[PDB]
């Protein structure tokens, strides 16, 4: 019982302290970090990292916190990193969060707030019953919780504290980073990979037990402008050209089923975001997504070919194409160092956790960092229902996440 | 030569006086008439009508001028009317018009303005050469001319002056009206049909020689709102519903060739005016037009049926239809008194004019007046290139228009 007692206690102590700090980010601010709460949280973590005993504890002028757990081995082991973000979602308030601890959960509905009649139900959240017997933490219904990503951050702190206090567990050098403004898309913008100094890293910002993510979409955006000629409707024969119809003609050339509303898993798509215009001019916006690089390029070429075909029919000025790549599949950067996914998978299996591979049907900080030279899979944290008042987390699962971090560290050293 | 000498002289004298008065209308004004120039023109015409010798010469508080040519017959003849509008187009300035008289026209290009290099060419206007030998009046390239509709108005004045001075030509009572704000769509709004007191009338607001119009579109307008559900693209399967695609699905059910850009003559259509929206909501505007009443109603029912079909597929709230009739085919009102078209046709043939029937692929003041209880065909005036700096008119054709008015009046009396 000793190991679990110590870990559960510490997880709850740190997590409840962190969620009580307002760290919501705000895109309307242009400082880095965007909100002062992130600076308060960072300064608190700097002191916590120093008290645990990590070295090289820094917080840069942009609020990025980094620290080192020195190697504890005679072997040459790659430097590995663990990452988490400081901020909470812009969707709902993260101010004055009142965490509620529900031990030995019965798997039934939880009344978060009697006065406001706010109830967390299994009907609305079918995964709720699977947490029977766990210790879960919820909000009081008036705020989100911030398990995304204070649960992952807590797990890193608890795992580092465990390692430094268990020198019999050998490991190479480990770097940790706590970063601002992930929720507004600015996290990687000021992440200094050279300063971080790791070969690869694990982002602790997944969700439920077993989550492992390391593949993401290739992405491009396109804007099509169609130009026509308006005339009085009555005298339009062989003179009028309806730009809106040209837009519909363009869309008609795309495979109807290759759209987000019909696809999942690794299936790609074309997605029509908007169409605005009239007879004289119409503008359509699309995104193009595919996990397979060859097929992604083929989707872009399909658009080019349709445009060429319509320009030959209506003239070069009738169709104008703006198209630019946006981001790429992180698997391309993981492949040369694929053992980093194998070690995470093996770590989970060794702890009797069934891994759940989740393709990232979009882009994340981990997928962008991968592109920047820091291959970074995303690992589960135990959180559910992120970005709203019904957010909750299983402390039992948080403990499993800590165990995974420890096992990954030991495994890199053992295999070196 | 006497008849033609007198008529050409008078046509040019009156027409050139009228075009020099700025009578452009302005929709931004909400007085009736919208501009003071129309009041000046009306007051001038009241005095001109009195000097010709017409009776019951009135100008109401809204600027509508009416007058009577008393019957000159012992027979019971229906009261017939002749109409023209006071205002010029909003498209180009009608201020300080400088009419140019080109006698014995050679059918070649006319330099309207040497200083600004403005030239009226047969390449740009292929009908120009057909006027070889005529006396034509043009602008100086800095204004429009106002033949629309001061040519028709002049023709009415010259015809009434001719009738009163030729009492040997028998006719029933004739009423004339000169109306403001036709060019901004407000003419019929304050036209008092009861006060006008005619069974039917002829609008002198056609164009080239032989023009005769008495059939117009039935019309309805529709606005379709499509409602969908937006989601993150990556997690859209069986959740997202793209409103813009619903709009395209709706349009796809309509016959592609039944559109203004592929139709002429009596062919009807559906016309997509605009489409604006995104995944959550999209709005399309259409007009529906058909000369045949049964087919017009069938087009409306087709739209209703498509909406019903889509509501059964997606739910009642997914598609919202606003649809209202706008105006109707004047032929329905002409049919009970069809002899009024026969008399105009016969009048033209008797003067060796080949009638040119022009379906009205829209709505006009004549078609709206018909609906209001005053069946009103539109007769040619001799004007070409209306609403711009290249507007011109054939005085030879103006003379033919005067002859047509006279013949129509005599013919009603002869057939009574
Ligand atoms: O041979 C490359 C070709 O193979 C595809 C699958 O048809 O992708 C495979 O190879 C990629 C490049 O090494 C891997 O990243 C990918 O995971 C693998 O399936 C095509 O996409 C690619 O053009
Ligand atoms: O640690 C992986 C990370 O480092 C970079 C830096 O250039 O690549 C290095 O490591 C790769 C994996 O072993 C080698 O293939 C490569 O030659 C070496 O430069 C990044 O490209 C990569 O993401
Ligand atoms: O029988 C009426 C029926 O005939 C159509 C032609 O198919 O129209 C004709 O009859 C109308 C009603 O009297 C006329 O106005 C029209 O000009 C004539 O062609 C249908 O439109 C109508 O339903
Ligand atoms: O002058 C035609 C005009 O008068 C109205 C007025 O009611 O109809 C009258 O004349 C018709 C044509 O002879 C008759 O069929 C009708 O009964 C009579 O009232 C208008 O309806 C019509 O446009
Ligand atoms: Na994304
Ligand atoms: Na019209
Ligand atoms: Zn997160
Ligand atoms: Zn988040
Ligand atoms: Zn006119
Ligand atoms: Zn006009």
Swiss-Prot record, chains A, B:
EC code(s) of this entry: 3.4.11.4
Amino-acid positions noted as binding Zn(2+) 2 in the UniProt annotation, renumbered to this chain: 148, 183, 387
An example Gene Ontology molecular-function term: metallopeptidase activity
PANTHER family in the record: PEPTIDASE T
Protein's cellular compartments: Cytoplasm
Gene3D superfamilies from the UniProt entry: 3.30.70.360, Zn peptidases
Record flagged with keyword Cell membrane: no
Keyword set, alphabetical order: Aminopeptidase, Cytoplasm, Hydrolase, Metal-binding, Metalloprotease, Protease, Zinc
Chain residues that bind Zn(2+) 1: 85, 148, 205
SUPFAM superfamilies membership: Bacterial exopeptidase dimerisation domain, Zn-dependent exopeptidases
Protein role: Cleaves the N-terminal amino acid of tripeptides.
Stated family: Belongs to the peptidase M20B family.
Annotated GO CC locations: cytosol
Catalytic activity: Release of the N-terminal residue from a tripeptide
Cofactor: Zn(2+)
Protein name listed in UniProt: Peptidase T
Cofactor-binding details, from the entry: Binds 2 Zn(2+) ions per subunit.
GO biological process: peptide catabolic process; proteolysis
Source taxon at top rank: Bacteria
UniProt-listed InterPro entries: ArgE/DapE_CS, Bact_exopeptidase_dim_dom, Peptidase_M20, Peptidase_M20_dimer, Peptidase_M20B
